[model samples]
Target: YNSGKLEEFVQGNLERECMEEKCSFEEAREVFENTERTTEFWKQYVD
Candidate 1:
């Protein structure tokens, strides 16, 4: 998997959400961990 793209997606999309919630990436990641939310961006990593 392209971890770089994954990080980009998280920083771009998820980071927006995190900012709205006044939280950090690690916080948002922890809150959404094990959920299907992260899978939504998996397609970007698949060529």
Candidate 2:
């Protein structure tokens, strides 16, 4: 994904950690790690 999109994703995860549960950066990074990054894949967790 693009840089802005990636940044938003990270920020969203961080927000989740702060408000909800403690989700690590590694867990979030796993979504794009060694895989095809797509908007659909990202949105799955985002929502």
Candidate 3:
């Protein structure tokens, strides 16, 4: 699978967590992006 699909998957999981964590959408997304920088198995291979 390409990164496009995994991107959506990450968004899905991120949104799920955001909804349950009482956090703002941007706040949650930022965290995800920040964390993913060090552990980006999702963005490992975009092709």
Candidate 4:
């Protein structure tokens, strides 16, 4: 997936994870914040 697809996947999964596990909004989404981290990973590989 490109960045757009990657973001879609992350949001879809994170919501599922959050809903399934009954996690708090902020706490459950801690990892969603890391999409930026993966962009760097994506860049590292894309180059």
Candidate 5:
């Protein structure tokens, strides 16, 4: 996925969680993949 898609996913989903947990994109996405859960609570979205 492109940065826009990643941005959308991050802004839409991650933004809230990140704010609540005081986490960053790097911390939220604790792994490397296309689309799936990074850890247990975080997920990666792609087009």
Candidate 6:
């Protein structure tokens, strides 16, 4: 069952944490790149 709940969970977390100024995958990546060390940091949260 490819529910995609995991993705939503992470997205929701980001939303709660202000990582995403708006609700979007691209926005999350953009925000992360701007504030964090690197885009690779997302891998730690996901996998």
Instruction: Give the per-residue lDDT digits (tens) of candidate 3, residues 1-47.
Output: 12233444443454344444444434434546565552453344222
The true-versus-predicted C-alpha distance at residue 17 of model 3, in Å, is: 8.9
For model 1 the local lDDT of residue 19 reads: 41
Clashing pairs in 3: none
lDDT per residue (tens digit) for residues 1-47 in model 6 = 11345554453244554343334334445445453544455555443
TM-score of model 1 (CA atoms): 0.26
Full candidate order by TM-score, most accurate first: 4, 1, 6, 2, 3, 5
The global Cα lDDT (0 to 1) of model 1 is 0.42
Pairs clashing within candidate 4: none
CA shift of 27, model 4, Å:
2.1
Model 1 segments more than 4 A misplaced: 1-21, 34-47
Q: Sorted on lDDT, highest at the top, how do the candidates line up?
A: 4, 6, 5, 2, 1, 3
- Give candidate 3 misplaced runs (Cα > 4 Å): 1-21, 34-47
Regions more than 4 Å wrong, model 4: 1-16, 34-47
User: Best TM-score goes to which candidate?
Assistant: 4
TM-score of candidate 4 to 2 decimals? 0.27
Report the C-alpha displacement of residue 25, candidate 1, in angstroms: 0.5
Model 4 lDDT per residue over 7-44, tens place: 43453454445444444334333565665654554454
- Model 1 is weakest, by summed lDDT over 10 consecutive residues, at 1-10
Which residue pairs clash in candidate 6?
none
For each candidate, what is the lDDT? 0.42, 0.43, 0.42, 0.44, 0.43, 0.43
- Preferred candidate (TM-score higher): 1 or 5: 1
What is the clash count of model 2? 0
RMSD of each: 10.2, 9.2, 11.1, 11.4, 9.8, 8.8
lDDT tens string, model 1, 1-47? 12333443443444445443344334444546643554454334223
Model 2 alpha-carbon drift over 4 Å, by segment:
1-19, 32-47
